Amino acid sequence: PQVTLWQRPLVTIKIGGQLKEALLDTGADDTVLEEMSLPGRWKPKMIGGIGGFIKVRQYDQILIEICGHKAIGTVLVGPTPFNVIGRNLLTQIGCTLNF
Amino acid sequence: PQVTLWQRPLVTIKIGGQLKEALLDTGADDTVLEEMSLPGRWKPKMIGGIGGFIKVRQYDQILIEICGHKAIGTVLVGPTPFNVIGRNLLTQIGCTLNF
Numbered sequence: 001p002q003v004t005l006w007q008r009p010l011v012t013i014k015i016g017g018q019l020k021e022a023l024l025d026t027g028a029d030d031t032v033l034e035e036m037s038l039p040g041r042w043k044p045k046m047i048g049g050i051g052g053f054i055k056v057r058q059y060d061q062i063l064i065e066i067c068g069h070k071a072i073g074t075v076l077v078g079p080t081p082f083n084v085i086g087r088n089l090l091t092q093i094g095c096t097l098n099f
Numbered sequence: 100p101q102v103t104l105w106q107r108p109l110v111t112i113k114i115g116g117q118l119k120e121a122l123l124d125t126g127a128d129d130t131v132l133e134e135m136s137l138p139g140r141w142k143p144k145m146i147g148g149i150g151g152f153i154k155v156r157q158y159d160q161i162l163i164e165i166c167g168h169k170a171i172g173t174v175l176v177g178p179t180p181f182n183v184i185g186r187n188l189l190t191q192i193g194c195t196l197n198f
């Protein structure tokens with residue numbers, strides 16, 4: 001749909017059998033989810049944000065359904081205050097900025 | 100214009116007589132700029148991010164021009180690694196997202 005930005009742009013995702021809400025986030029390069037059960041292998045890493053760095057686990061190749069579109073990608077799981085969908089998935093879903 | 104998200108969506112801003120680049124960031128409610136000299140006076144404020152929180156100072160009713168577009172609003176100046184344009188200014192330049 002279009003999304004105006006008068007409100008936080010939130011979306012429903014399904015990942016790992018579970019339903020969550022997530023913020024559409026053009027300023028983020030990667031997707032970062034609050035701590036969640038995912039099956040599998042993962043490799044740790046750090047990301048920095050505004051505020052310092054977190055240590056996060058990266059899982060590659062995770063299927064997310066976002067709104068109702070499907071994507072496979074890397075997601076990072078860690079101590080974020082909100083789930084963010086970053087540009088690595090935004091580009092799969094077809095998301096564009098318009099002004 | 101329309102901006103796809105294969106690369107970081109940067110724009111040039113003009114703010115307080117200085118030219119800078121910033122990320123159009125849908126995830127951020129407000130605009131946070133790296134430290135720079137701005138006139139007026141300000142209030143101490145604290146925002147949270149990934150990583151944690153920073154003390155910023157808030158200036159309100161500053162004019163910023165983002166592409167050719169003027170907007171006036173609150174800008175937080177402080178320890179961000181990257182100048183971030185958030186939703187408070189994005190709505191004024193008529194930015195939407197679309198998928």
Ligand SMILES: O=C1N(Cc2ccc(CO)cc2)[C@H](Cc2ccccc2)[C@H](O)[C@@H](O)[C@@H](Cc2ccccc2)N1Cc1ccc(CO)cc1
Nearest residue numbers: 027028029030048049050082126127128129147148149181
């Ligand atoms: O740290 C934030 N990252 C950091 C970030 C970096 C990398 C990834 C994964 O690759 C994910 C998130 C982004 C801004 C930023 C970009 C580049 C360098 C440094 C910072 C993001 O784009 C912004 O949306 C929120 C993400 C967020 C969303 C909801 C809740 C917490 C964090 N933030 C924090 C932020 C908070 C408030 C304001 C102003 O109100 C601005 C930014």
